[PDB]
């Protein structure tokens, strides 16, 4: 859990001000819980972490060298097109996960703010709209048989119109 990826803003919790003389069950109930649920489960997780610590193991995040793109890939040579298409699928999946991260970042803010989500949950909504625009420009109307070549055709069918707009 990297708090930069997942912000989780801080918590302004106030002081309990018991302006009365009648007790509060919740407090003694929480104490009883701490004593009869937390303590033993904590000890057990400590034991398990002990076994872990004494027989640790490490695993690495696989890196992927960059290969040529479709642009430098001839019109019928498949040894290159395979590499390029695999790379494109890889980046497509990573972009799926990026968008899912943004959405998981927006739901939390909505739930947190509550009735103030229309005023305090705006930069997240803006990031969402932006990444949505990007995902749409990259992958919206490709189809079930999507591929780097169709993405490239989309890019060019967009850029020619943008060029017309630029010149006039």
């Amino acid at each position: 859990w990297d708090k930069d990826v997942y912000p989780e803003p801080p918590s302004r919790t106030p002081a309990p001000s018991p302006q009365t003389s009648l007790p509060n069950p919740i407090t003694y109930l929480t104490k009883a819980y701490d004593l009869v649920v937390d303590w033993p489960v904590t000890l057990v997780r400590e034991f398990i972490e002990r076994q872990h610590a004494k027989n640790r193991t490490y695993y690495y995040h696989r890196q992927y060298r960059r290969v040529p793109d479709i642009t430098e890939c001839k019109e019928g040579d498949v040894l290159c097109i395979y590499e390029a298409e695999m790379q494109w699928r890889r980046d497509f999946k990573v972009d799926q996960e990026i968008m899912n991260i943004i959405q998981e970042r927006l739901k939390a803010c909505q739930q947190r703010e509550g009735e103030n989500y229309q005023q305090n949950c705006a930069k997240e909504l803006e990031q969402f709209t932006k990444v949505t625009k990007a995902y749409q420009d990259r992958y919206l109307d490709l189809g079930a048989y999507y591929s780097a070549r169709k993405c490239l055709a989309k890019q060019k069918q967009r850029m020619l119109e943008e060029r017309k707009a630029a010149r006039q």
Binding site: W1, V5, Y6, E8, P10, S11, R12, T13, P14, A15, S17, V36, V37, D38, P40, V41, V44, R45, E104, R105, K107, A108, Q111, R112, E113, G114
Partner: protein, 60 residues
């Protein structure tokens, strides 16, 4: 009977559930997302030793 049932049908499950929560649901970022606690003037927050000032004179 009440006590043995309590134990064998609440405690054990409660232990398993506390384990699950504490070590597979709070270790993850956005699994337990509480709303924010109401704060009113005079409620002195504790995470910063702060105190927000009271309101204005009430006409009446």
């Amino acid at each position: 009977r009440s006590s043995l049932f309590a134990v064998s049908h609440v405690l054990i499950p409660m232990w398993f559930v506390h384990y699950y929560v504490k070590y597979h649901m709070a270790t993850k970022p956005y699994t337990i997302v509480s709303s924010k606690p109401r704060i009113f003037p005079g409620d002195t927050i504790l995470e910063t030793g702060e105190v927000i000032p009271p309101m204005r004179d009430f006409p009446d």
